[PDB]
C-alpha cells in the first residue's frame, strides 16, 4: 500500500480493528522505509485513542490533547483533519508527505472533504501514497454492514418532540442508549423529557464534544443525546442505538444566503456509522438498533461540498494548478475549479475570518471577496430588513464597538450563526468587535 501513485481504501466493517490493529502495523512499515508520514484524526478524542494504540512508536503529536515529550527525531506526524487544511491555507511550510493516512475518512465537514481532495490529487500526480480508513466510503448504499456480534434491527416511529404516551419501549429499557437527533435544539427537548422521567442524560454536539465526552467515562448515564458528530469514531459502552435517521442540511439559495433545510433523511453512510456504535463486543450479542426513517443521498447540493471547493481554490499546489475533490465525491457540487481563488490580501482576510472570527466558510468568503477587512463589522448591521436575526421572538441587539445599540441585520445571512443559543452568542460577540 505504501508505494507512490497508490490510494488504498481500507474498508473493514466498524469495529474490525482498523485503528488499534491495522494502523500500528502500517506505521511500523512506514518508519522502516523512511517514509515521511502524516496521520489525520477527525477529533482530539480519536487523537487520544491513537496515542494509546501507537504507544512506543516515534510519533510527533501536533495537538495539545496529548501530553508527550517528543525526541525531535520523529518522521511520523499526527494532527486533526482541520489542522492539516488550516496549515495548508496559512503561510506556514507543510512537508510534502510520502504517506498520507486518513482515519474516519467518511467525515463530511468542509475541511475533511478539502484534505481528501488535496491528498488524492497529489496521489493522482504520482507524488505520494494514501490510505483512507473507513467502513463507509463515499457513495455506499448499504446501511446495515457486518459487525463483531449480531444486531437486532427494528424499523420504528421515533419521537422528535417531548411525549406523554405511545413510546413505552424508549423508557422501559434498563441499559445504556445512544440517541442520534437532527439538531442541538431538538436534543434539548428530548433530553428535558427524559430527565423529567428520571433518566440521567448527557448531551454531545460539535462545540461541547471533548468536554462532555469525558462524562461518558467519568459518570453513570442512561442516555446520550448526540448530533451527527458521534458518527466519527466515538466509542460508547452501550447496548442500544435509537436513530431518528434525520439531519439538517445547509443549503445555499440563489447564491446569496445559507438556510438550514430539513430535518431530512441521512445518507446510508451516516445510518451505518450511527448503527455501528453498537454490536462491537463479540461476547455481547443482541444490541438493538431502532430507526425512525429511510436513507437518501442528501449530500447532493449540501453546502459543505461548495465550501470545500472555496478552501481548495485558495491552497497552493503547483503554479496555477488547483486540487480537485476526491473523485467519488466530486459530483456533489456544481462548481468551476478556480472560481473562488482570492488575491493574496483577500485570502488572508478569508483565513482570519474562519480561524479567529470562527465564521462558516461560505460567510467568510462573502465578506473577504467584497474587499472588507477583518476588523470592519459594519456589514453585521447593514443588511435588508428580512436579514434581521431574531432572539426569543424579538430582534437580536448588540452594542457596537462605537458604543451604539443596534439591531443585528447582516448583509449576508447564514443560518449557522444563529442555529442555537451558543452560536448566536458567539456571533453577537463578533458583531460587537470582541474578537
Ligand atoms: C510539534 C511541531 C509542530 C507543531 S504545531 C502544533 N499545534 C498547532 C495547532 N494545533 C495545536 C498545536 N503542535 C506542534 C508540535
UniProtKB/Swiss-Prot annotation:
Q: Where is this site: Involved in NS3 ATPase and RTPase activities?
A: 274, 277
Instruction: Report membrane topology.
Output: Peripheral membrane protein
Q: What is the protein's species of origin?
A: Zika virus
Quaternary structure, from the entry = Forms a heterodimer with NS2B. Interacts with NS4B. Interacts with unphosphorylated RNA-directed RNA polymerase NS5; this interaction stimulates RNA-directed RNA polymerase NS5 guanylyltransferase activity. Interacts with non-structural protein 2A. Interacts with host SHFL; this interaction promotes NS3 degradation via a lysosome-dependent pathway. Interacts with host CEP63; this interaction disorganizes the centrosome and inhibits host innate immune response.
Question: Motif DEAH box in this chain: where?
Answer: 103-106
Q: Which residues lie on this side of the membrane: Lumenal?
A: 1-435
Residues found modified as N6-acetyllysine: 207
| Annotated spans, Important for RNA-binding | 3-6
Give the Helicase C-terminal domain ranges: 150-329
PTM text: Acetylated by host KAT5. Acetylation modulates NS3 RNA-binding and unwinding activities and plays an important positive role for viral replication.
Q: What is this protein called?
A: Serine protease NS3
